[PDB]
C-alpha cells in the first residue's frame, strides 16, 4: 500500500528528539511488509544540504500565501519528499527554535503549511502518486486530517501518532484567519481549545485513528496524569486509539556482533558476559567480585524517577550489591548521585554526562537495569537490556509496564519471566523490587533462564512495523 507520512523531522536528516527516530525507523522496517512510505519534510537548509539529485516534481503557486517546490529524493534508505518553501525552511538554525533560542514567532504558520501541502497530495494533486492514507507524525503534522477534512475533496483515511504531548501547537485565536480554514473550523468539533488555537487537538479530533508509542502509554494519556489537558478529547475518541511499543535497531544493538563492547555472546553462551562485567567495574574504578551488579542508565530526572533511585542506593550496598550510574539531568539529582557514591567507594561508582560507548557496555556486564520512571511513553534502555541479557527491574509505567514480564509465581512456573516490575513508583516498591532481584541473582538456574529468555524477545522494528501496518489496513479499510 501507500503511505504519505508527514513530520517536521526524520532521523538521518534533522533530528530533535526521539520523533526523529520512529519517522526514519518505521518507513524503512515498514517495506518488509508490503509497504511503501513517503516522507513529507520541511527543506530545512541542512536537509537540502544532504540529499542528491532532488527531483522538481511539483510546485505550490499558494501555501498560506507562499511559493513551494515538491522535491522528491532518495536519501539514506528513505523514499522522501521535501517541501521546498525558502519563505517558511531556509533559515539559519535549530527546526523550531531561532539563533536565539526562542520558536520562531512563525512556526504556526510554518508547519500548517507542511499540514497543507500533504493533505493537497492527499487529495492526489501529485500525477503518478496519491497515497493511500496519510500518518501524521506529532502537533507538526497533526494539522494534515484537518485540512483535508475540510478541503472539498473528501478524505483519505489518516492515523495521527502522539510522540510528544506535551507539544501541542497551541497558538493564538488571532492566527486563525491565516490558516485558510472554514469559519466552523474553529469549533468544539475542530481546532478551538479554550478560545486559543491548538494544531494537536485539531488533529485529535480529525484524524481516523489514533495511536502514541506504547499500550500503557495510550491509556495512561486518558487520565489527567499524563493527558497534559487533551485527555478529554482523547477519551471522546479512544474506540479509535491505539498503542504500539517503539522497536529499535537490533543490528546496531546485538550482543554478537557490537563492536562498542569488551566480549561479544549470545543467550547461548552467556559466559562471556562475565568478561564485560569485569570491564564494567574497571572502568567505573569499584571493587570486580561476582555481587550483584546494577545499573542505571539514564536522564537524571523526577520524571525518570531518579529522586527516587537516589534513596535507594543505601538499600542496594546492604544488600551485598553495587550500582553504577551512566547519565545526566537535574543537578541536584546529579549531586545526589555523586555525593551518595562518595561514601560508598568500592561499591557505587556514577559517571555525570553522555557516553553511548559505554551505555552498550554497561548492558553486556552489568547483571540487572533500574528503570523507576514516573513517565515513560515507551523506552529503549528495558530493550536494550532484555537483548542483551541484563535483567530489567522496571516501575510499571507506560511501556516499561508493557515490554517486561514479571517475575511473579505463575511466569516462574511456566519459565516465562523476563524481569521485575513494581508498581507503584514509590521508594518502598523500588527497594522491594531491588530485593527480588537480589533473590533472584541468588537462583543461578532461575536467573540464566530468564536472561535466555529475555534475548529472545523480538524487539525490531519490524516486528512494530507489522503492528502498523495491520493497523494501515484496517484503516484502508
Given at each position: 500500500?501507500?503511505?504519505?507520512?508527514?513530520?517536521?523531522?526524520?532521523?538521518?536528516?534533522?533530528?530533535?528528539?526521539?520523533?526523529?527516530?520512529?519517522?526514519?525507523?518505521?518507513?524503512?522496517?515498514?517495506?518488509?511488509?508490503?509497504?511503501?512510505?513517503?516522507?513529507?519534510?520541511?527543506?530545512?537548509?541542512?536537509?537540502?544540504?544532504?540529499?542528491?539529485?532532488?527531483?522538481?516534481?511539483?510546485?505550490?503557486?499558494?501555501?498560506?500565501?507562499?511559493?513551494?517546490?515538491?522535491?522528491?529524493?532518495?536519501?539514506?534508505?528513505?523514499?522522501?519528499?521535501?517541501?521546498?518553501?525558502?519563505?517558511?525552511?531556509?533559515?539559519?538554525?535549530?527546526?523550531?527554535?531561532?539563533?536565539?533560542?526562542?520558536?520562531?514567532?512563525?512556526?504556526?504558520?510554518?508547519?500548517a503549511?507542511?499540514s497543507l501541502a500533504a493533505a493537497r497530495i492527499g487529495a492526489g494533486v501529485?500525477?503518478?502518486?496519491?497515497?493511500?492514507?496519510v500518518?501524521?507524525?506529532?502537533?507538526?503534522?497533526?494539522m494534515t486530517p484537518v485540512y483535508m477534512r475540510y478541503a472539498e475533496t473528501p478524505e483519505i483515511?489518516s492515523?495521527?501518532?502522539?510522540?510528544?504531548?506535551?507539544?501541542?501547537?497551541?497558538?493564538?485565536?488571532?492566527?486563525?484567519?491565516?490558516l485558510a480554514l472554514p469559519?466552523h473550523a474553529?469549533?468544539?468539533?475542530g481546532?478551538?481549545?479554550?478560545?486559543?488555537?491548538?494544531?494537536?487537538?485539531g488533529?485529535?479530533?480529525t484524524?481516523?485513528?489514533?495511536?502514541?508509542?506504547?499500550?500503557?502509554?495510550?491509556?495512561?494519556?486518558?487520565?489527567?496524569?499524563?493527558?497534559?489537558?487533551?485527555?478529554?478529547?482523547?477519551?471522546?475518541?479512544?474506540?479509535?486509539?491505539?498503542?504500539?511499543?517503539?522497536?529499535?535497531?537490533?543490528?546496531?544493538?546485538?550482543?554478537?556482533?557490537?563492536?562498542?563492547?569488551?566480549?561479544?555472546?549470545?543467550?547461548?553462551?552467556?559466559?562471556?558476559?562475565?568478561?564485560?562485567?569485569?570491564?564494567?567495574?574497571?572502568?567505573?574504578?569499584?571493587?570486580?567480585?561476582?555481587?550483584?551488579?546494577?545499573?542505571?542508565?539514564?536522564?537524571?530526572?523526577?520524571?525518570?524517577?531518579?529522586?527516587?533511585?537516589?534513596?535507594?542506593?543505601?538499600?542496594?550496598?546492604?544488600?551485598?550489591?553495587?550500582?553504577?550510574?551512566?547519565?545526566?539531568?537535574?543537578?541536584?539529582?546529579?549531586?545526589?548521585?555523586?555525593?551518595?557514591?562518595?561514601?560508598?567507594?568500592?561499591?557505587?561508582?556514577?559517571?555525570?554526562?553522555?557516553?553511548?560507548?559505554?551505555?552498550?557496555?554497561?548492558?553486556?556486564?552489568?547483571?540487572?537495569?533500574?528503570?523507576?520512571?514516573?513517565?515513560?511513553?515507551?523506552?529503549?534502555?528495558?530493550?536494550?537490556?532484555?537483548?542483551?541479557?541484563?535483567?530489567?527491574?522496571?516501575?510499571?509505567?507506560?511501556?516499561?509496564?508493557?515490554?517486561?514480564?514479571?517475575?511473579?509465581?505463575?511466569?516462574?512456573?511456566?519459565?516465562?519471566?523476563?524481569?521485575?516490575?513494581?508498581?507503584?513508583?514509590?521508594?518502598?516498591?523500588?527497594?522491594?523490587?531491588?530485593?527480588?532481584?537480589?533473590?533472584?541473582?541468588?537462583?543461578?538456574?532461575?536467573?540464566?533462564?530468564?536472561?535466555?529468555?529475555?534475548?529472545?524477545?523480538?524487539?525490531?522494528?519490524?516486528?512494530?512495523?507489522?503492528?502498523?501496518?495491520?493497523?494501515?489496513?484496517?484503516?484502508?479499510?
Amino acid at each position: 500500500m501507500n503511505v504519505l507520512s508527514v513530520s517536521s523531522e526524520i532521523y538521518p536528516l534533522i533530528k530533535t528528539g526521539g520523533l526523529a527516530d520512529v519517522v526514519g525507523a518505521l518507513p524503512i522496517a515498514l517495506e518488509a511488509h508490503g509497504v511503501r512510505t513517503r516522507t513529507l519534510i520541511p527543506g530545512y537548509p541542512a536537509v537540502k544540504a544532504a540529499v542528491t539529485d532532488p527531483v522538481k516534481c511539483f510546485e505550490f503557486t499558494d501555501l498560506l500565501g507562499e511559493k513551494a517546490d515538491l522535491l522528491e529524493v532518495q536519501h539514506e534508505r528513505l523514499d522522501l519528499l521535501i517541501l521546498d518553501a525558502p519563505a517558511y525552511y531556509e533559515r539559519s538554525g535549530g527546526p523550531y527554535l531561532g539563533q536565539t533560542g526562542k520558536d520562531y514567532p512563525d512556526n504556526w504558520k510554518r508547519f500548517a503549511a507542511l499540514s497543507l501541502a500533504a493533505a493537497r497530495i492527499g487529495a492526489g494533486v501529485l500525477p503518478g502518486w496519491r497515497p493511500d492514507m496519510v500518518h501524521a507524525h506529532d502537533w507538526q503534522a497533526a494539522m494534515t486530517p484537518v485540512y483535508m477534512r475540510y478541503a472539498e475533496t473528501p478524505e483519505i483515511p489518516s492515523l495521527l501518532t502522539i510522540h510528544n504531548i506535551a507539544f501541542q501547537g497551541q497558538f493564538g485565536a488571532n492566527i486563525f484567519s491565516k490558516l485558510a480554514l472554514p469559519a466552523h473550523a474553529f469549533g468544539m468539533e475542530g481546532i478551538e481549545y479554550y478560545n486559543d488555537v491548538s494544531f494537536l487537538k485539531g488533529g485529535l479530533q480529525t484524524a481516523t485513528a489514533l495511536s502514541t508509542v506504547s499500550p500503557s502509554y495510550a491509556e495512561e494519556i486518558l487520565t489527567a496524569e499524563f493527558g497534559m489537558g487533551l485527555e478529554g478529547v482523547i477519551g471522546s475518541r479512544a474506540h479509535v486509539l491505539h498503542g504500539i511499543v517503539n522497536g529499535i535497531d537490533a543490528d546496531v544493538w546485538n550482543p554478537a556482533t557490537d563492536h562498542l563492547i569488551h566480549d561479544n555472546y549470545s543467550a547461548a553462551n552467556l559466559k562471556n558476559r562475565a568478561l564485560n562485567k569485569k570491564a564494567v567495574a574497571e572502568h567505573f574504578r569499584i571493587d570486580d567480585d561476582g555481587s550483584p551488579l546494577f545499573c542505571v542508565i539514564s536522564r537524571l530526572t523526577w520524571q525518570k524517577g531518579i529522586d527516587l533511585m537516589a534513596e535507594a542506593v543505601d538499600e542496594i550496598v546492604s544488600l551485598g550489591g553495587r550500582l553504577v550510574v551512566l547519565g545526566a539531568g537535574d543537578v541536584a539529582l546529579e549531586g545526589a548521585l555523586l555525593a551518595a557514591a562518595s561514601r560508598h567507594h568500592g561499591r557505587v561508582g556514577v559517571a555525570i554526562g553522555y557516553n553511548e560507548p559505554l551505555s552498550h557496555l554497561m548492558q553486556a556486564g552489568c547483571d540487572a537495569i533500574i528503570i523507576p520512571s514516573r513517565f515513560e511513553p515507551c523506552g529503549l534502555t528495558q530493550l536494550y537490556a532484555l537483548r542483551y541479557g541484563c535483567i530489567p527491574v522496571v516501575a510499571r509505567t507506560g511501556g516499561l509496564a508493557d515490554t517486561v514480564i514479571d517475575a511473579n509465581h505463575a511466569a516462574l512456573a511456566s519459565k516465562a519471566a523476563t524481569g521485575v516490575q513494581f508498581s507503584p513508583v514509590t521508594l518502598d516498591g523500588l527497594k522491594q523490587a531491588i530485593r527480588r532481584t537480589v533473590r533472584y541473582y541468588h537462583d543461578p538456574k532461575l536467573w540464566t533462564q530468564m536472561q535466555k529468555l529475555g534475548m529472545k524477545s523480538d524487539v525490531s522494528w519490524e516486528k512494530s512495523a507489522g503492528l502498523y501496518a495491520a493497523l494501515y489496513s484496517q484503516l484502508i479499510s
